[PDB]
């Protein structure tokens, strides 16, 4: 539901292409994704797929593919009404169904309303009913699109399945000859001129969608000149407008730079170096690069004994990677704790101050603070930080500063004030000698509850991992035409805790209940087999059914 990818075409070493995918849906027990190989009836695939969808969201067929979350505006809200269940569209037109909910140890009823724009989310009686997805009516087709693309053996046969995929999803392409591609897929609405997509529109007639934008408009690239295609839920393409989610922004501050900077530090990549990026990005502090110039020059005039400079010198001597100590409960460097403090104080003085309470709670987060069991998904630059970053840029930002976030004061003054806050709160917690600071390392968990918050295992089955890693729920890599070896394609992945979720009534766990769980933690990986020899040579069991019809 976020997640990352880097396809490598000119940029591969000892191979023709390397696709490394790392979808981030959170970490669960049993594993979110499911390994499967399908052979016959047109298919010839191996990979792993969320919730065992018939279609393999991540795999290869001897071309490879993957997905990240697109985050395009494919959903708009129509503001429809004291003639109940009717709405005006110069005439009084609702569809309703009745739903009763059975309850185990309790009592059973409500109605759901649909307009010609869609389901009614909310009725504000003091004024209006709000109800529209560009992909409505194409859900199953989107499923069968993800299935049929598995049979594709070239760019055209692939893209014509991409264009039947109606949800906002980045798809990716690589093939045996070193060709790579990208299609920000999805149905999108052809809006009226004047339609602001960030806010509802009236649903009285004049603002209805004209229909769907053409697939010609869906962002695409094939064999780009950079020799790669990187993404971490960032803008597909110039002038491409994001989803309307208030907490979501595509600005100058973006974590995908952390990928891009790595993929430009050297001319080519082996399949090993490509996989090694999961490690690098995993432990990478995402805010140091953004705010360190500003901190560096806000404290340039201070003396060394000044705590506010001391903090910044500590950040200045840091490579921006977090490694947890052998005790398994602390980081080697206090950098993130420092930036978390400062950033929290800064947002409280700028973005939050400028927003009327209680909406300042939307922009308070420094993007670090988390509960004991560790982060629920990936880590990102927060919406507050991003806005702040545009303000720190000033006239270098294309964004018009309607309200000054610095309240008439110079940047350096607010920056220094937040450092003083940071120092007060951090010197209280870990004491007055910075070189002794043992700041809490972030942990990771494989929660026994699915993303809905509904249990999919016993509370006991939750698994722990000392080091949180900012990486895919699973990671898969495909390498095409490797110079060494007899195989045209080499694939790897890792489905932690393991392939099975089975526990027998006597409480005996399956052999493969837990055998990838240490593999995940160490950035290891198992091989994916495609060919009938490779499969048979590594068989552990073999069953044959007769199915009638």
């Amino acid at each position: 539901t976020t997640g990352n990818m880097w396809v490598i075409g000119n940029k591969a070493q000892d191979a023709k292409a390397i696709m490394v995918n790392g979808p981030q849906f959170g970490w669960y027990a049993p594993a979110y994704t499911y390994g499967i190989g399908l052979h016959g009836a047109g298919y010839d695939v191996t990979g792993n797929t969320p919730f065992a969808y018939p279609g393999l969201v991540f795999g290869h067929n001897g071309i490879s593919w993957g997905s990240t979350a697109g985050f395009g505006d494919d959903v708009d809200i129509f503001a429809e009404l004291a003639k109940p269940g009717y709405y005006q569209h110069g005439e009084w037109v609702m569809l309703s169904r009745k739903e009763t909910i059975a309850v185990k140890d309790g009592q059973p009823t409500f109605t759901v309303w649909r307009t010609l724009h869609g389901n009614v989310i909310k009725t504000d009686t003091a004024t209006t009913a709000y109800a529209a997805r560009a992909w409505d009516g194409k859900e199953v087709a989107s499923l069968l699109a993800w299935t049929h693309q598995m049979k594709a053996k070239n760019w055209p046969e692939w893209t014509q399945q991409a264009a039947k995929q109606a949800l906002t999803i980045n798809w990716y392409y690589a093939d045996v000859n070193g060709n790579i591609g990208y299609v920000h897929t999805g149905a999108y609405p052809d809006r009226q001129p004047g339609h602001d997509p960030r806010l509802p529109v009236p649903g009285t007639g004049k603002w209805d969608w004209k229909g769907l934008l053409s697939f010609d408009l869906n962002p695409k690239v094939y064999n780009p000149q950079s020799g790669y295609i990187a993404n971490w839920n960032n803008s597909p393409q110039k002038d491409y407008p994001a989803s309307d989610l208030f907490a979501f922004l595509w600005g100058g501050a973006d974590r995908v730079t952390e990928i891009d900077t790595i993929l430009d530090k050297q001319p080519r990549f082996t399949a090993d170096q490509a996989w090694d990026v999961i490690r690098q990005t995993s432990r990478r502090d995402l805010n140091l690069r953004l705010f360190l110039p500003a901190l560096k020059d806000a404290t340039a005039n201070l003396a060394e004994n000044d705590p506010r400079r001391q903090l910044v010198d500590k950040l200045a001597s840091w490579d921006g990677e977090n490694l947890v100590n052998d005790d398994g409960k602390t980081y080697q460097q206090p950098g993130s704790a420092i930036l978390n403090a400062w950033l929290t104080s800064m947002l409280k003085r700028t973005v939050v101050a400028a927003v009327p309470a209680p909406f300042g709670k939307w922009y308070s987060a420094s993007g670090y603070e988390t509960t004991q069991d560790g982060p629920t998904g990936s880590l990102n630059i927060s919406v507050g930080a991003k806005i702040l970053y545009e303000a720190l840029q000033g006239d270098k930002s294309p964004i018009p500063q309607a309200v000054d976030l610095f309240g008439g004061k110079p940047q350096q003054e607010v920056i220094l004030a937040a450092l003083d806050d940071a120092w007060q709160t951090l010197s209280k917690r870990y004491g007055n000698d910075v070189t002794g600071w043992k700041t809490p390392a972030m942990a990771l968990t494989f929660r026994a509850n699915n993303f809905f918050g509904v249990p999919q295992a016993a509370a006991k089955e939750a698994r722990h991992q000392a080091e949180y890693q900012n990486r895919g729920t699973e990671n898969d890599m495909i390498v095409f035409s490797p110079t060494s070896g007899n195989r045209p394609v080499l694939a790897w992945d890792v489905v932690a805790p393991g392939q099975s979720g089975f526990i027998a009534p006597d409480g005996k766990a399956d052999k493969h209940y837990d055998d990838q769980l240490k593999m995940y933690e160490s950035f290891g990986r198992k091989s994916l087999w495609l060919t009938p020899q490779d499969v048979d040579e590594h068989k552990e069991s073999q069953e044959v059914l007769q199915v009638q019809r």
């Binding site: 190989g37 739903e99 185990k104 499923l143 509802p200 009236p202 973006d254 309200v403 999919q456 016993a458």
Partner: protein
């Protein structure tokens, strides 16, 4: 034999068949993940409280199932075979009910039933579509209303563009700028006087909290304030 269909490696199954292939798939899944898959089926359809009692979350029932029913009904016979076969595969592994093979979790939680093509479809639609491709907070109008009550109509809307910008040309893009995106009413809207994002809460273990409506709102607020889009109340 034409009617013949499984080999396993770290436990990963490979299916061999010569046509309705997805039966094999359905089968191996019901062996490996029968409980997880049953609780995805209940989650995507809002039937969780039928077995779990705090989850009346169920009121998911954010979609129109008759639409999805009708989509399935108009499929080609071959497309339909995927869904039909996966379901029948799952159902065959009847064997659990004949020799309760029953995952411990069913016993612990106190209730499996057969599947249909709808259920299978619904696993995708409940997750990829109704959850992940459905991201809106147009919460935005409530922010706008409050922004205007503090700065005035004009300056409010200018501050709204500073916080939720429509486009930003300095943003890193996967497709390098050297193609671009060729496609280059707020004052008609009523006021929005609590933001819906507050009526969505989960605890640290990821479980739903069963708070009161007031309390839930207070909680959602509190944790979003602390952790944001990447926290327990994030998206």
């Amino acid at each position: 034999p034409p009617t013949e269909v499984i080999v396993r490696d770290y436990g990963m199954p490979h299916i061999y068949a010569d046509d309705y292939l997805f039966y094999g798939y359905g089968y191996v899944v019901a062996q490996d993940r029968l409980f997880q898959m049953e609780m995805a089926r209940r989650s995507t359809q809002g039937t969780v409280s039928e077995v779990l009692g705090a989850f009346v979350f169920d009121k998911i029932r954010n979609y129109w199932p008759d639409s999805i029913r009708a989509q399935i009904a108009s499929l080609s016979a071959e497309d339909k075979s995927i869904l039909q076969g996966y379901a029948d595969g799952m159902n065959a592994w009847d064997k659990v009910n004949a020799s309760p093979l029953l995952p411990q979790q069913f016993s612990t939680f106190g209730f499996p039933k057969h599947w249909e093509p709808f259920d299978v479809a619904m696993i995708f639609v409940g997750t990829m579509a109704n959850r992940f491709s459905d991201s809106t907070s147009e919460d935005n109008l409530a922010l706008l209303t409050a922004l205007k009550d503090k700065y005035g109509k004009q300056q409010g809307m200018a501050v709204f563009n500073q916080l939720k910008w429509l486009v930003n040309p300095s943003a890193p893009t996967t497709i390098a700028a050297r193609s671009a995106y060729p496609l280059k009413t707020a004052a008609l809207l009523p006021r929005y006087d609590p933001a819906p994002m507050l009526d969505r809460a989960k605890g640290t273990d990821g479980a739903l909290l069963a708070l009161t409506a007031d309390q839930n709102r207070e909680t959602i607020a509190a944790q979003f304030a602390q952790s944001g889009a990447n926290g327990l109340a994030g998206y």
